[model samples]
Target: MKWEMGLQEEYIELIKAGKKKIEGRLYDEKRRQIKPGDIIIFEGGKLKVKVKGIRVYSSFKEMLEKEGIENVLPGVKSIEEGVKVYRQFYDEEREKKYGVVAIEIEPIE
Candidate 1:
């Protein structure tokens, strides 16, 4: 499936460099639809990617435990930062309402 989303410029660079593999998001109405082979176009269709796999988690912390911080957060080494940064993009109520997902992706040529 094809989809559209946006990412921070820094994270985009990390993905381009092959340093990042998992992009996490709330498993809300739309996100829960993503499946393997699905395509995602980031910010004006500039950085398109293919969904490689999917891993669902009750929380970002659990994601970090299973997916690793390097793949999810890249340059970061701390799960603290992972949870903290994710908190900025997502909040508790909705996070609990829908949970989270690790949208494993690879940059498309």
Candidate 2:
């Protein structure tokens, strides 16, 4: 199945330019369906990417510590700031329930 992922405008550009290759998300049901070789449509169809890999982490903090904040949120100044922004969208309950996954992707030319 074709998977769809939404990204902010800035990140969209980063991905397009090959600066950002990893896309992070909650490891929910939808994410669970993803696999390497799957095609992911992003940003209202402006970009189409192929999943290269998926890495799961126990929590956002762990993910940040291992992958680095810059790899995930390119313009974010620090891990603390990145966590703050992530928390605004995903709370403790959701984080606990779903954990997190970093989806490695390459934009289709």
Candidate 3:
């Protein structure tokens, strides 16, 4: 089975070029259903990525501390800034409920 996800165009480009290997998201029901070898369609069919692995964290701050902010958010300058940007998409309540996950993926040629 496949899942669809929308990503910033810039990040899509990075993924296509193999510069970005991980996609971060709240570990909600949909994400929890993902497993290694699943296909993810991104950017409204612009790219196809295969899930290679997954890592879970209790919180965004913990993810940042262990995985580093740059690894999770490529161009972000700081942890606080990254979290702020994430909050723009996911509210505090949702984040607190689902925690966080790093979905490692590789672009499918």
Candidate 4:
């Protein structure tokens, strides 16, 4: 399947050449389908990458701590701030219930 996700332009560029590695996501129903050896199409297929790994955690904090703050959300000063960044898309209730995943990806030209 051609898995796809929409990302803001800023993050897309950052993922392309800047401080981004793993793309953090709420481990919701739609997200659970992601698996290794799959390719994710990001930003309307502007970028495509192979899924390298999928690390699960009980919370965003746990994901960041175990996956490394820099690897998950680079340039963030703190894990709290990273959580705040994620709040743009997900709220705490969903986060608590579904937890989160750190999708490790390798970009392709």
Candidate 5:
């Protein structure tokens, strides 16, 4: 099922600036476009469950520019940091507290 979505750019900007941390499930949009240090929330359609993880890519632009070529990789960051940013983003919007279950650091090459 395709989920409708909206983002508050202003709030996300605050998160990037180290002012917020999120506590909830975050479903990622488009696995290919994911970048390193990004926190994602995924939904299991069949099970109707939420899962969270941190994406670790080698290079964001290259991975996209080259169309998933061999040896494409992005940098790495701590899930803790990602969570902190997540919390901050939601806090700005007054979202309820949520939980993260996993940190998906993909070692793709």
Candidate 6:
């Protein structure tokens, strides 16, 4: 398992599997297929993460209606523990790949 601060924590699986860590934003293609309520697990980092949440869609005007509550992009929220678990899971996965690389989180809202 690998370990790194910032976004690098998200690619542990790729690194461990002997795959090259692709350059660019973390979400590029990996997260393309993820839907709203999916659970993300990062197994090898400081934090093992498991996040559960729902997916919602809205028009620009609707997002504006909620203003501060909602942003132009989709988002996720869980009981405080959920966030912690998710971070750990993702972090570990990233580390597993290259000890400590870089990662980025992209939401497919």
If scored against the real structure, what TM-score would every candidate get?
Answer: 0.96, 0.92, 0.91, 0.92, 0.24, 0.22
Tens digit per residue, CA lDDT, model 4, 86-106: 888899899999989999988
- Segments in model 5 whose C-alpha atoms lie over 4 Å from true places: 7-76, 91-98, 101-109
Worst 10 residues of 5 by lDDT: 67-76
lDDT of 6 by residue, 53-108 (tens): 22222222222233322121123242333224334544534433423212222221
| Highest-scoring model, lDDT | 1
User: What order do candidates take by TM-score, descending?
Assistant: 1, 4, 2, 3, 5, 6
Q: Could you tell me the TM-score of candidate 4? A: 0.92
Determine which window of 10 residues in candidate 2 has minimal summed lDDT.
64-73
The numbered model that scores best in TM-score is 1
Candidate 2, superposed: residue stretches over 4 Å from native: none
Clashing pairs in 2: none
All candidates' lDDT scores?
A: 0.91, 0.85, 0.86, 0.86, 0.30, 0.30
**Model 1 superposed RMSD (Cα):** 0.8
Candidate 3 residue runs with Cα over 4 Å from true position: none
Q: Model 6: runs farther than 4 Å from truth?
A: 1-27, 53-109
- How well is each residue in 5-92 modelled by candidate 2, as lDDT tens digits? 6778888888888877788888998899899989999978989999999899978888877777777788888888877877987888
> Per-residue lDDT tens digits of candidate 5, residues 1-109?
2222233544333333433232122323343343345533222221111112443323333222332211111121444444354455434232222222222222111
20-93: candidate 1 lDDT, tens digit per residue:
99899999998989999999999877799999998898998998889999998987779998899999989988
Query: How accurate locally is residue 50 in candidate 2, as Cα lDDT from 0 to 100?
Result: 90
RMSD of each candidate relative to the true structure: 0.8, 1.2, 1.3, 1.2, 14.4, 15.1
Backbone N/Cα/C clashes per model? 0, 0, 0, 0, 17, 30
Please tell me which model should have the higher TM-score, number 2 or number 3.
2
